[PDB]
UniProtKB/Swiss-Prot annotation, chain A:
The gene is ppsC. It comes from Mycobacterium tuberculosis (strain ATCC 25618 / H37Rv). Was identified as a high-confidence drug target. Part of the PpsABCDE complex involved in the biosynthesis of the lipid core common to phthiocerols and phenolphthiocerols by successive additions of malonyl-CoA or methylmalonyl-CoA extender units. PpsA can accept as substrate the activated forms of either icosanoyl (C20), docosanoyl (C22) or lignoceroyl (C24) groups from FadD26, or a (4-hydroxyphenyl)-C17 or (4-hydroxyphenyl)-C19 fatty acyl from FadD29. PpsA initiates the biosynthesis and extends its substrate using a malonyl-CoA extender unit. The PpsB and PpsC proteins add the second and third malonyl-CoA extender units. The chain holds residues 1572 to 1750 of 2188 of the full protein. This is Phenolphthiocerol/phthiocerol polyketide synthase subunit C. Homodimer.
């Protein structure tokens, strides 16, 4: 779904760069990638030079993604992306997941983390309140972090005003192309 | 052996507090078993950052050693009383970062005292939490749970960790990080 430019970019940069430590060559899975946050995430991932794996909910959205030159475009309405990506990666998986999918997608996305992997949950507390995670799934230096941008902005508005200026400098100096 | 011990302690504490934990000035960090090698590396790096340091240790003499370092709190690493104790001391706030090497009930009780935005860093080997589970509602206020296995990390990315250890040592050589004993 849509998000304003400031929400989309703050969410995607805090999630991929600060929490997710995304670095060149790493494999990132961005669910719902045609949405506001998803496209900010694909724009940032391209700046960093990560390998980009995506999903979306319609043929037309998926077609828009195949045109961006990414490694993988799967269906956000199914959990088939997990096996598809393991197949594609010869068992590696991905280094960071930026998740906005509900239910089985959370467990499957945690399952396909590589060693050192970072799972970032953007869903509302609703989505995972009942859910539990087995800590054995994080043992190979992996992590699970929730990002609630509304809360973060409420608690640290100065820090996020500064981060927005930082991100926009990258736009102004041509480092970050807004897609 | 001495050079290696120091590199493991400092790589563990710096990757955990600075890279994974994003520790920043004035944040509250809980360092368990703070008189151990990694624990002391983390106290030293927390002092460099200007965090507010909460600690535990397992004897009276080790607790006294920590009280002499000038930290906010020294509690018992063999009890889960620290969780209530720190909530009382911080008037309900809890802590921003937990650097955990305790097994058992201390893992759930340290996750419960994370502030919003809090980061729990688990240093135990896998056998410590192999059948442990975490309700994800516990992470809802922008919180996170990260395992750090430095042995694994060194196998996987040796050049990156060589660069990090050089950075740390340069910081110490230049007086920016004081190694505490
Ligand atoms: Na705009
Ligand atoms: Na979609
Ligand atoms: Na799918
Ligand atoms: Na695992
Ligand atoms: Na205990
Ligand atoms: Na914070
Ligand atoms: Na949440």
């Amino acid at each position: 779904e849509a998000a304003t430019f400031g929400v989309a970019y703050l969410t995607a940069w805090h999630s991929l760069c600060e929490v997710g430590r995304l670095s060149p060559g790493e494999r990132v899975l961005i669910h719902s990638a045609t949405g506001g946050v998803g496209m900010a995430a694909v724009s940032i991932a391209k700046m960093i030079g990560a390998r980009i794996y995506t999903t979306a909910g319609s043929d037309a959205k998926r077609e828009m993604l195949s045109r961006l030159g990414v490694e993988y475009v799967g269906d956000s309405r199914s959990v088939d992306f997990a096996d598809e990506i393991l197949e594609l990666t010869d068992g590696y998986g991905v280094d960071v997941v930026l998740n906005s999918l509900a239910g089985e997608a959370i467990q499957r996305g945690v399952q396909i983390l590589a060693p050192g992997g970072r799972f970032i949950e953007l869903g509302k507390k609703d989505v995972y309140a009942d859910a539990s995670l087995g800590l054995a799934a994080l043992a190979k230096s992996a992590s699970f972090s929730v990002v609630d941008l509304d809360l973060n902005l409420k608690l640290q508005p100065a820090r996020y005003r500064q981060l927005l200026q930082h991100i926009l400098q990258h736009v102004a100096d041509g480092k970050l192309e807004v897609l």
